[PDB]
Design an enzyme around this catalytic site. Structure first.
Site, short mmCIF file in Angstrom:
data_model
loop_
_atom_site.label_atom_id
_atom_site.label_comp_id
_atom_site.label_asym_id
_atom_site.label_seq_id
_atom_site.Cartn_x
_atom_site.Cartn_y
_atom_site.Cartn_z
N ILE B 26 -10.58 9.43 53.80
CA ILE B 26 -11.92 9.88 53.27
C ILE B 26 -12.63 9.65 53.51
O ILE B 26 -13.55 10.41 54.88
CB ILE B 26 -11.95 10.61 52.34
CG1 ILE B 26 -11.77 9.32 50.85
CG2 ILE B 26 -10.69 11.52 51.26
CD1 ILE B 26 -11.62 9.97 50.12
N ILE B 27 -14.72 7.28 56.59
CA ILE B 27 -14.18 5.84 56.39
C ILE B 27 -14.72 5.03 55.49
O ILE B 27 -15.36 3.77 54.98
CB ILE B 27 -15.49 4.67 57.57
CG1 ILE B 27 -16.27 5.57 59.26
CG2 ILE B 27 -15.53 3.54 58.21
CD1 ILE B 27 -16.62 4.74 59.65
N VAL B 28 -14.24 6.00 54.42
CA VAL B 28 -13.73 5.22 53.32
C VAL B 28 -12.36 5.65 52.62
O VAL B 28 -11.65 7.22 52.91
CB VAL B 28 -15.21 6.11 51.83
CG1 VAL B 28 -14.49 6.05 50.74
CG2 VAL B 28 -16.42 5.57 52.66
N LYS B 43 -14.36 1.50 49.07
CA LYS B 43 -15.04 1.93 50.38
C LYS B 43 -15.89 0.84 51.27
O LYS B 43 -16.48 -0.25 50.52
CB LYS B 43 -17.27 2.64 50.32
CG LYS B 43 -18.25 2.04 50.98
CD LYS B 43 -19.49 2.79 51.20
CE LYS B 43 -19.51 2.85 49.54
NZ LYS B 43 -20.88 4.22 49.34
N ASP B 139 -32.89 12.02 48.51
CA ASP B 139 -32.41 12.90 49.14
C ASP B 139 -30.52 13.52 48.89
O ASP B 139 -30.21 13.33 48.96
CB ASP B 139 -31.57 11.99 50.13
CG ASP B 139 -30.93 12.30 51.21
OD1 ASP B 139 -31.21 13.26 51.84
OD2 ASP B 139 -30.49 11.97 52.14
#
Lengths: 315, 346, 10
Positions: B26, B27-28, B43, B139
Site C-alpha cells: 500500500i 512502498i509500505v 514501512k 505540513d
C-alpha cells in the site's frame, strides 16, 4: 445639535485659537457637523487657520470627512490655495484623490485656480494625473482652459512618467521603447518610489526589463521601503530576470534595513535555480539578517530541504 | 539468527519477522501480526543513513515515534533490521498501526454534523499533543490524516523534516499558511490554518485555494478572504511588503458566501444552528493574520467541537523527549549509520 | 449525544 459644538464651529471659523482650546478641553465634540455636513476642520481649512487645524487634528478630527456635495477639507484647501494646510492634512492621512459629486479631485481645483505648489505637493503625494470628472476633464485640461501653462507642462510631464510606469505594469515592450525613444525617464518613480524596473521585475516581463537596463535603468534602485528589483525577482521566483539584473551590475550582497539579501529571499519559497545563479555571482552565505539567520538557516525553517543540502556544504 | 522470511513486494524485497504474515503493498506493506493478532503497517527505509537529509528525517521519526503515545497519532508497534551487524546494516523496518483510508476519501462524502465535528475533534487532540511535545507539524493535509471504519482518526506523521517516506502515497502549497509564504515567522497555530483548509474542503468538497505555485497561493487567498488590513502589512518585510501592497486589492467574501447553508446539512433547529457554528469556527481558523487566528486550545473549546471534549484526550501529559536529539547537528554518514543502528538493533 | 461509531469507507 450639541451646544458645545455650535460654539466650536464658530470658534474655529473665527480663528479663536484660545476659544477652540478651551472648547475642546471642556469636552466639545471635535467632529460635529452643520446643516450641510461641514465640520470644524472644514471651516478652519476654508478660512486658513493652520494653528486650529493642527489643534483639531491632535484631538482626533476626521481628516477625510465629507459634506453634502462630497467635498473634504482637502478640496477646500486645494480650492482656496493654503499650502501649509494641504501639507498638514496630507501628513495626517488625507485622501489625495477624494472626489465629489461630479468627480472633481483636489488636483482639478489646484490646476484650475493655478495653485502651483499645491499641484506639485498633490503630485508628490500620489495625485492621479489622469483623473477625470463626470464631464471628462483632467487637471491638465483645466490648467489649459484657464491659462496656467506652466502647470500644464508639469501635468504633461507627470502624465508621461505615468504612461511609462503603467506600460511597465501592463503594457507592451513596443510602448515602453516608444516612450523611451520619445523622451521618457527610465528612472521615473511613483509616490512609493517604484520605477518601471521595479514594476517590470515583479511582473516577470523579461523583454521590458532588458529594454530598461539597455537605456540606462538603475539596477540598484530602492523604493520607499528600501526594496530593489533583484530582491523582488529573487523572492517572487523570476529566474531569467535575476540573471539579467546581475548581468547589468546588480549588487548580489546588498541588504535592506532588516539585513535581507537576495539569497535569503530565494530560500523562503525555495527557488533552486535562482540560488545557483546568486552563488555564481558571489552571494555570501555567512551573511546574517537582523535576526542572525543565514540563507541556510531559512531553508530549514521553511522546509525547503533540497535547498538546505546545498548551503550546508558551503556553510 | 534468521527469524525472518523475505517476500517479493514489487521491485524491492521485504524481509520481515515471521510474526508478520500476508504482506500486501500500500512502498509500505500491510501485514497481520500473529503475535498481537491484528493487522499492522510495515514501512521500509532502505539505507536512511546515506545522506544528511534522509538521515535526519529518519532519526527524528524513530526517536519521536518511540516517545509520543496518543490515540489520534499513529503509533509505533515495533522496529527491526534484518541485518545483524553495523557493517552489514542497511534497511530499517517500522511497524505501525494500520488504518483504512485517508481524508481524501472522506472529503468526497457529505458528512453529518456529528461525524464532521467528531473527526475534527480528533484532529485537534492529535495536533495539540504534538504541540505540547514541541512539535509543530507545518505540513498538514488530507493525505497525512487517516481514518478507520469505526470513525476513528489519526495523524499519520510528524511533518516537515520529521518524516521518512509516505505510507498512504495532494500538494502542500494548497494548505500552507500565508505567514510562511510571506517570509514571516510561525507559531503553533500554522497548523490551524491547515485545519481550516481541510475543514473547508470537507464542507464544499473542493480545494479552497488551488494555486499554481506558492506565490499564486497568496493570490487565491486574498481573492477569497480579502486583502488584509494595513496593520498586518507593517509586519511584513520590505521586499514582501512591496510585493503584497502592489497586488490588486480585494474585498473578500463573507464566510456566509464562502460556505452557504446549502453545503451543510440544514433541516432542523439543531442542524441550522450547527451549520452556523461550523461557519464560525471556519472564520476563526481561516484568518491570514495569525495573531488574530485562534489557538488549538480555543478550537477545542468551540461550541462545534467541545461536545466531545474529554480531558483524558485533550489534556494528556506531554512526552519527555530526550535532551537535544532533534537539533540540526551535522554528522558523517558513518556517525548517522551508528546513531540509526543504535536505535534499531534488538 | 453518542460518539459516531461507524464511517462508510470504500
Amino acid at each position: 445639535g450639541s451646544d458645545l459644538g455650535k460654539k466650536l464651529l464658530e470658534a474655529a471659523r473665527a480663528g479663536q485659537d484660545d476659544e477652540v482650546r478651551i472648547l475642546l478641553a471642556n469636552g466639545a465634540d471635535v467632529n460635529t457637523a452643520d446643516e450641510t455636513g461641514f465640520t470644524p476642520l472644514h471651516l478652519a481649512a476654508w478660512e486658513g487657520h493652520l494653528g486650529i487645524v493642527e489643534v483639531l487634528l491632535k484631538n482626533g478630527a476626521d481628516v477625510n470627512a465629507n459634506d453634502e456635495r462630497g467635498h473634504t477639507p482637502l478640496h477646500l484647501a486645494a480650492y482656496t490655495g493654503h499650502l501649509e494646510i494641504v501639507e498638514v492634512l496630507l501628513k495626517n492621512g488625507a485622501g489625495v484623490n477624494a472626489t465629489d459629486v461630479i468627480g472633481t479631485a483636489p488636483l482639478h481645483l489646484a490646476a484650475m485656480w493655478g495653485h502651483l505648489e499645491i499641484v506639485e505637493v498633490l503630485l508628490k503625494n500620489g495625485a492621479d494625473v489622469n483623473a477625470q470628472d463626470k464631464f471628462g476633464k483632467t487637471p491638465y485640461d483645466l490648467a489649459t482652459d484657464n491659462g496656467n501653462q506652466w502647470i500644464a507642462e508639469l501635468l504633461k510631464r507627470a502624465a508621461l512618467r505615468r504612461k511609462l510606469l503603467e506600460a511597465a505594469r501592463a503594457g507592451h515592450r513596443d510602448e515602453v521603447e516608444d516612450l523611451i525613444k520619445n523622451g521618457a525617464d527610465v528612472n521615473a518613480i511613483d509616490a512609493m518610489g517604484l520605477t518601471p524596473l521595479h514594476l517590470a521585475a515583479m511582473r516577470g516581463h523579461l523583454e521590458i526589463v532588458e529594454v530598461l537596463l539597455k537605456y540606462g535603468a538603475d539596477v540598484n534602485a530602492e523604493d520607499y521601503y528600501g526594496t530593489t528589483p533583484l530582491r523582488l525577482a529573487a523572492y517572487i521566483g523570476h529566474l531569467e530576470i535575476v540573471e539579467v539584473l546581475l548581468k547589468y551590475g546588480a549588487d548580489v550582497n546588498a541588504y535592506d534595513i532588516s539585513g535581507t539579501t537576495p539569497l535569503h529571499l530565494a530560500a523562503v519559497l525555495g527557488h533552486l535555480e535562482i540560488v545557483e545563479v546568486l552563488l555564481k555571482y558571489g552571494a555570501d552565505v555567512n551573511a546574517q539578517d537582523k535576526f542572525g539567520k543565514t540563507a541556510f538557516d531559512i531553508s530549514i525553517d521553511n522546509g525547503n530541504e533540497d535547498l538546505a543540502e546545498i548551503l550546508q556544504k558551503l556553510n | 539468527d534468521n527469524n525472518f522470511y523475505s517476500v517479493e513486494i514489487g521491485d524491492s524485497t521485504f524481509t520481515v519477522l515471521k510474526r508478520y504474515q500476508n504482506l500486501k503493498p500500500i512502498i509500505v506493506c500491510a501485514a497481520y501480526d500473529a503475535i498481537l493478532e491484528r493487522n499492522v503497517a510495515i514501512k521500509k527505509l532502505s539505507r536512511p543513513f546515506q545522506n544528511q537529509t534522509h538521515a535526519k528525517r529518519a532519526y527524528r521519526e524513530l526517536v519521536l515515534m518511540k516517545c509520543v503515545n496518543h490515540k489520534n497519532i499513529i503509533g509505533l508497534l515495533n522496529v527491526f533490521t534484518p541485518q545483524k551487524s553495523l557493517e552489514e546494516f542497511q534497511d530499517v523496518y517500522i511497524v505501525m498501526e494500520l488504518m483504512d483510508a485517508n481524508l481524501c476519501q472522506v472529503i468526497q462524502m457529505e458528512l453529518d454534523h456529528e461525524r464532521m465535528s467528531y473527526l475534527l475533534y480528533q484532529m485537534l487532540c492529535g495536533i495539540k499533543h504534538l504541540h505540547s511535545a514541541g512539535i509543530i507539524h507545518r505540513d498538514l493535509k488530507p493525505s497525512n490524516i487517516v481514518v478507520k471504519s469505526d470513525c476513528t482518526l489519526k495523524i499519520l506523521d510528524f511533518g516537515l523534516a520529521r518524516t521518512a517516506g509516505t505510507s498512504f502515497m495532494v500538494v502542500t502549497r494548497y494548505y500552507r499558511a500565508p505567514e510562511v509564504i510571506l517570509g514571516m515567522g510561525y507559531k503553533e497555530n500554522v497548523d490551524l490554518w491547515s485545519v481550516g483548509c481541510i475543514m473547508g474542503e470537507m464542507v464544499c468538497h473542493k480545494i479552497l485555494f488551488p494555486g499554481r505555485d506558492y506565490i499564486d497561493q497568496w493570490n487565491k487567498v486574498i481573492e477569497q478572504l480579502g486583502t488584509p488590513c494595513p496593520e498586518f502589512m507593517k509586519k511584513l518585510q520590505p521586499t514582501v511588503r512591496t510585493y503584497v501592497e502592489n497586488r490588486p486589492k480585494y474585498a473578500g467574501y463573507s464566510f456566509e458566501k464562502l460556505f452557504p447553508d446549502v453545503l451543510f446539512p440544514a433541516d432542523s433547529e439543531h442542524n441550522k444552528l450547527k451549520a452556523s457554528q461550523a461557519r464560525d469556527l471556519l472564520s476563526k481558523m481561516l484568518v491570514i493574520d495569525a495573531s488574530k487566528r485562534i489557538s488549538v486550545d480555543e478550537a477545542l473549546q468551540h461550541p462545534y467541537i467541545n461536545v466531545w471534549y474529554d480531558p483524558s484526550e485533550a489534556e494528556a501529559p506531554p512526552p519527555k523527549i530526550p535532551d537535544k536529539q532533534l537539533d540540526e547537528r551535522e554528522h558523517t554518514i558513518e556517525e548517522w549509520k551508528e546513531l540509526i543502528y543504535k536505535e534499531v538493533m534488538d | 449525544p453518542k460518539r459516531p461509531t461507524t464511517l462508510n469507507l470504500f
